Design a protein around this ligand. Structure first.
Ligand SMILES: O=C(O)CN(c1cccc(-n2ncc(C(=O)O)c2[C@H]2C[C@@H]2c2ccccc2)c1)S(=O)(=O)c1ccccc1
Length: 290
């Protein structure tokens, strides 16, 4: 369990960013690591087998917007990125989840297309294959895995921001709606902690949110927990040692550098560090130090 860092990849501030930076909760330090080969915002991060994966996004620059179908793999042992097989389609504002060593890429946008499609990556074969699409088209969708079930939460379908959520049952290759959230949330941070799916922040169609709610998969209810100190949409999120960390985002005024940490035992958020610069739309995951 020792020696793990919180990695933040990519993001946006004025343009899409290539940064890979890693935070050590044990000593408060930050390390700047190998840049992404292509800057990307609106991507997601995940880890399989100790390797960090950066999935999807878009490269916004002064000279273009290119939605990304890319899957790139970072090895902390070498501090190097390698390309992996690309997805079937570009997916900006993506969500991802891992089940049993396989990466699920969910939703996202390609130009004005809002995807319901979902695809699954097999690292052993370096192949993607499509699975059943969601019941709803969702961009800015929060994704998490609990008990080997995949959840897609909130987002934007092209017309409305969403409070709805749905669950994917892999052995049936089927999606089913779950109880909707109490709040419409697009671009929220979604993660799993203990037996609950948390949805932190986001945009409700009117304001960036500091509220946080959690879905208990046994009772099928959403309950609010303590709100974050900062309103934020397009935040990064991960779980480490029993606590939720939220990174950056947009509060309606500033691209935040704040990192807050949620303790479920006390139901409190604390501000624990700042990123080296404010940014939104990052991918975040946890793996060993490089
Ligand atoms: O991809 C990008 O359009 C910028 N990014 C992004 C990445 C992930 C999620 C999001 N998101 N969250 C909440 C919402 C929301 O409107 O409901 C969105 C964007 C996707 C939704 C959208 C809706 C209608 C028209 C256009 C877009 C944004 S960003 O570059 O990180 C950034 C964030 C905040 C301010 C500036 C830039």
């Amino acid at each position: 369990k020792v020696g793990r860092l919180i990695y933040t990849a990519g993001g946006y501030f004025r343009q899409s960013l290539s940064y890979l930076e890693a935070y050590n909760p044990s000593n408060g330090s930050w390390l700047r690591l190998a840049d992404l080969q292509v800057p990307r915002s609106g991507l997601a991060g995940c880890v399989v087998g100790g390797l960090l994966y950066a999935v999807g996004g878009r490269n916004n620059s002064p000279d273009g917007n290119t939605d990304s179908s890319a899957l790139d793999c970072y090895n902390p042992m070498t501090n190097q990125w390698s390309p992996c097989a690309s997805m079937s389609v570009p997916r900006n504002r993506i969500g991802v989840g891992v089940i049993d060593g396989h990466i699920y890429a969910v939703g996202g946008s390609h130009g004005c297309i809002h995807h319901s499609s979902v695809e699954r990556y097999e690292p052993e074969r370096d192949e993607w294959h499509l699975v059943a699409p969601m019941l709803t088209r969702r961009i800015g969708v929060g994704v998490a895995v609990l008990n080997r079930l995949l959840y897609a939460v909130g987002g934007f379908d092209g017309t409305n921001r969403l409070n709805s959520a749905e669950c994917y049952y892999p052995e049936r290759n089927e999606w089913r709606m779950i109880t909707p959230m109490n709040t419409i949330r697009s671009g929220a941070g979604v993660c799993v902690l203990h037996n609950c799916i948390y949805a932190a922040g986001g945009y409700d169609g009117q304001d960036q949110l500091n509220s946080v709610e959690r879905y208990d998969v046994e009772t099928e209810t959403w309950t609010f927990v303590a709100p974050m100190r900062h309103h934020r949409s397009a935040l990064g999120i991960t779980v480490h040692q029993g606590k939720i960390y939220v990174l950056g985002g947009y509060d309606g005024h500033t691209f935040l550098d704040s990192v807050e940490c949620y303790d479920p035992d006390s139901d409190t958020w604390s501000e624990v560090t700042r990123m080296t610069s404010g940014r939104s739309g990052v991918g975040v995951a946890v793996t060993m130090e490089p």
